[PDB]
Design a protein around this ligand. Structure first.
Ligand SMILES: *Cc1c(COP(=O)(O)O)cnc(C)c1O
Ligand SMILES: *Cc1c(COP(=O)(O)O)cnc(C)c1O
Ligand SMILES: *Cc1c(COP(=O)(O)O)cnc(C)c1O
Ligand SMILES: *C(=C)C[C@H](N)C(=O)O
Ligand SMILES: *C(=C)C[C@H](N)C(=O)O
Ligand SMILES: *C(=C)C[C@H](N)C(=O)O
Lengths: 392, 390, 376, 373
């Protein structure tokens, strides 16, 4: 009942940007070019690479590949997801307004609220999961709308096409979708009318818990030109070696994400039928309030499962303490299963009062279900919940 | 008669941040930790997320700080990213004074980008201390200088400039020390608040890492910078951190050889009849040569000159080089030549270039670590091929 | 109908040798330790060896600079005068090493078709100390009864049975579980699976055999880079999901080729047409991406077929994410003597495919149009 | 009065193998090519890379550079110095003899004695500091003579050309020189008549204590072809990443080695003036018994300094225990200063690139702890 899978995604993940004819060696895998600079035939040269920060072989290959995966004309790679966000925010100018989804990655909240806001930029956090609130929030000064769907960590789901229609109805406003949770395998914001599909590649895109990186895919020519200028001019660029590592991780994205889905659904179903679990938030469950919308705008679901443990903070901590396969740690989207308590870990950067309004309570637990054997994951959760045994 | 060499520099380059006691393995060289995340004993709890901090970067930062005589250092994805991050110390309404001759990208960022977010930018010849004094306003919060400047190699008295900037109030003085390295110049010892590097150049020195570095002593300033390193996320790969830290361990021996080769080149060019003017701080003809000896322990591989004739002669010279490579960047083991007006400084407005003296006959060399006579031979034959009007 | 999948494989691939407690940082991925000197082998290699050992069901594993270096090191377990029996169809480089190098150092090399157990039983001599098999064989994909061969080789004497498990991976076949003494890989293929690491791996249970190998790992110094160990160990964490996709795509490719009237014969362990198909299901949990076929016609048709592929790439090697095609007689097995090739069936029209992880429909389309170009 | 320094050595270190025209990108530094395989135009054609183990861009650039630094036609890179040695030994066949120097690297000794000897190869250890001993050990079965100079820890110096003439006069005999501890900046065995100049790159060649690698430089065409066949066939090959790192390390070999020499001489001289040092062995001191051979055979000396402390083993131990800058370890030839106690009073130093005065102070300080006033 989900959107059919995107045609040629695996083939393109494996081949786009990776053409052996690019290289004098005819290497089937692109070389890692670390060189900072490149020999020119003559000064002032509308041709070839000039300086690594501006462009380089290995990054350019990754970017072509990711663009294809997004269904985009262009992609730009960055030192981090947060650096991608900063770079996108520099598309604006003093006097402009930014609307940000109310529930986002704690670092996104922090950057807008505490940093961007000091540079002539007005920041409004709006629950864009209610389309009419986004509509009522847009002002003549609105230039950027920043959404996550599903949101990190409460996994509210936003109608991308509906928001796109609203945002584009009047004025000249950029709609960004931070697609970190879904990956382009399961969701294509550009197809749904977003102007930018952004990633923390640190999570699923790379998927190997060993690269910090951001990615920004785009179709519109002037917007690309503006972004490319800032990639070079702000210089928040990724190592070519990280570009290689990410591009390598991309070649298994399809097979990893299918297994994140299988395992994530299994975990989500298990927790929902568990008497020590108050509530489960998983887009793949009929219980999710936007489950049908998910099926309309996605081809599947990820390994991110949010739930509320019964009881108190104590029970949440005893549960986490008793995990023997899941690891207590920040981040998500890697091969290993992770568990965290956002209110005190990843979203400690979000003001407590906002946490409270958003439902990021002492008992909200976020899981990043990895690629381990399903039976081992379920047994780990089962024993850890029994160790906590909150009132049922 | 330069400043004596900084004590323990080589010892510290090799040892600071590299204690084997840090690792279960007792490795003499720090491992490259690529892990994005780290296990916690309880929620909130050591390392927690690579961007915020990680073993390999933290090791490099300690080493660089030692080399600057600094308490603290922060590493960034590029020299430009360092510059952007420092600029985020400010807020709408603040003014930035920038040295009039800087790396084209610095000019581009300030002029075209930072100016759009409520920051006022003034480009001022800070090599003339009275122009700076006149330029300071109550809104001035950042003074950004290079010395020597890229590419015309104007030299600024850092201590004099610091004294001026700090006389009235809360103004940050940055010295972009990319060209000299902390081996030859220590801006923090001379009263700068920040010593910044494009580590892409000499710090790494192996033409294979893009990175920036920022050293600081002030607690408050460090904390503000640290916040922005995490919050803006323009952070370097841990593997690039390892490569740069490895490059640092030959910085002393590379820099001495850059100085030797650079001086030989500068002297060759100045007595060559096809050369109009040479700009090298190590030569007595440099207008600030005496200042340079007072604030530096030596000179670098960067040599700027003006060829006689026109752009056509500059182009013939460049095209005839056989050892020197026509390329952007600087500070590596290999010798590079370029024409800033058309290449690295095409991002500087033409009227600004003309005002600064970045003409179509200005050539910049980055003299590398090849054999001196081979480098002088290459230049000699290329100038002969150009043979401009003498 | 296959052997049930090995329990905990995915969990072990991701976690064994990866305990964060090993590091002062509590890193969830092991650091790359390059240091050659230590204040008074290496962590990254040890983590990899532990993981691979677990995946094989083995007590130990030793990593090498390449599959050939693994093979050379194993051969140094012997001494002048010992005899090696080698499967008659093997990787060209294995053939070359035994026939051209090892033979020159007082070792006797006999090539025998161990797919016929009776022939192995007959070839054994009191001087036989090493039996070296591949299953399925590279490139003709003959299948050897590993347990049957083990019972035979271990009936008398002291003979090491090596299974080069490169083609299958331990996800699909565990030679140590079936009685082999050594499960060996060119990790360069499926184990790493990303076409960017050259490495050998040797999994072993027996204590004195391990000590003997460990000594040779040390003494001959054919050891892998710690960074390559990290890359391989990283590759390992998707082995389960890669191999399952290789199986689905490889089976679709095989079935497509066998139903194609321009194809003379398909050799794929997962097809019922394969002579050892039932044996494969008894000793394996599934099949890989390796598909061998004979094109109808001559060398010319094979060459036109290969020229016309637009997704499969013409190249040596196998086991990677990308689909590859080759003509073994001219490429990877040019190192096998012509006469040996002809006896083995490695003819002018034997094509070997390493089916990768691309979309199934894209791969079948490529094969279809290319066969059509050769046989209009 | 050493051999004059080799012309264009720094230029060649930086540029040979590193031509930007090799790459479509025109990168000034060679890319690290990890690809195991390469697209072919047609089966079995006579061009390009086909398989990484057989040859690859990054390794090939390294071999080019090292060959030039040795003054050699060819170079072959291996996974380790030991893998180089094993590969070299596979040039022979059952029945041949190897003559090896007595004071060889333990790894070399161990391989020949414990492994090679079991595969039909006769190994004979001989004192090659006495040229007539070497002479009289040669037999019709002799195919390889393996020397190393200076020796460690005692720094005996072997006359390379002397050995070469003796060996070559007797026929089809391969003379190998392990040049690990000199580098070709200071010693060119092929220029002095050796057939093979061989390295553990792990020490000075790379010099950054982060690469295990072997290198083998050769001029003779058939010898090369034989070695190349075995590089592919035995497969003890280096990672392309390690090749990159070694090639990067080599770009500073000249400036590193001059500093090792400078600190090394200073340390050697300090120890030689010190009344609590019984004896110093350093080829750069007039006191070295082969000091004149060294100046005829070499352009300079390294950071390797061996000395005997006055007293007993206890004094040596107190010395080692009190070092605060020198690090106690079992390795060598990197940028940091190391000390080892491998007689009872014999200490081996690998003097690194730290500040000379810090290094002298550390030694002085430690000697005073062993022999208080
Ligand atoms: C990880 C995270 C980010 C931040 O990206 P970094 O790579 O950590 O800078 C942004 N959005 C989401 C949804 C995230 O999970
Ligand atoms: C190179 C350069 C910069 C910019 O550094 P990047 O690493 O290229 O971003 C800044 N200042 C000077 C003097 C430079 O030469
Ligand atoms: C690739 C191959 C080898 C040789 O391995 P290398 O890593 O290339 O030295 C050995 N056995 C089989 C089955 C192979 O396919
Ligand atoms: C980001 C992934 C979480 C982290 N703790 C931060 O604050 O940046
Ligand atoms: C920086 C090294 C110069 C460059 N071409 C740029 O524009 O950033
Ligand atoms: C090995 C994968 C094939 C190669 N051509 C060789 O002969 O080693």
């Amino acid at each position: 009942g989900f959107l059919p899978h995107f045609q040629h995604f695996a083939t393109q993940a494996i081949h786009v940007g990776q053409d052996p004819e690019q290289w004098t060696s005819r290497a089937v895998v692109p070389p890692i070019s670390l060189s900072t600079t490149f020999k020119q035939g003559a000064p002032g040269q509308h041709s070839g690479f000039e300086y690594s920060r501006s462009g380089n072989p290995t990054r350019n290959c990754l970017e072509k590949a990711v663009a294809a995966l997004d269904g985009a004309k262009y992609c730009l790679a960055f030192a981090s997801g947060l650096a991608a966000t900063v770079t996108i925010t520099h598309l604006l100018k003093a006097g402009d307004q930014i609307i940000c989804m109310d529930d986002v990655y704690g670092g996104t909240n922090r950057y807008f609220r505490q940093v961007a806001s000091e540079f002539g930029l007005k920041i409004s956090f709006v629950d864009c999961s209610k389309i009419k609130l986004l509509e009522a929030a847009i002002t003549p000064e609105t230039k950027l709308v920043w959404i996550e769907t599903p949101t990190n960590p409460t996994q509210k789901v936003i109608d991308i096409e509906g928001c796109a229609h609203i945002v584009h109805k009047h004025g000249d406003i950029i709609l960004v979708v931070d697609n970190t949770f879904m990956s382009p395998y399961f969701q294509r914001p550009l197809a749904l009318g977003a102007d930018i599909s952004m990633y923390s590649a640190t999570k699923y895109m790379n998927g190997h818990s060993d690269v910090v990186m951001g990615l920004v895919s785009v179709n519109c020519e002037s917007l690309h030109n503006r972004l490319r200028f800032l990639q070079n001019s702000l210089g928040a660029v990724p190592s070519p070696i990280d570009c290689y590592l990410c591009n390598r991780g991309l070649k298994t994205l399809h097979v990893r994400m299918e297994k994140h889905f299988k395992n994530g659904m299994a975990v989500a179903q298990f927790l929902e039928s568990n008497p020590w679990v108050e509530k489960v938030i998983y887009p793949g469950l009929p219980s999710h309030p936007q489950h049908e919308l998910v099926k309309r705008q996605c081809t599947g679901c990820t390994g991110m499962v949010t739930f509320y443990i019964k009881g108190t903070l104590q029970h949440a901590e005893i549960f986490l303490k008793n995990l023997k396969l899941f690891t207590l740690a920040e981040s998500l989207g890697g091969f290993e299963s992770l568990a965290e308590l956002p209110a005190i870990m990843t979203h400690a950067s979000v003001l407590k009062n906002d946490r409270d309004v958003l439902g990021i309570s002492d008992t909200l637990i976020r899981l990043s279900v990895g690629l381990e054997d399903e039976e081992d994951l379920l047994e780990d959760l089962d024993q850890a919940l029994k160790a906590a045994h909150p009132p049922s």
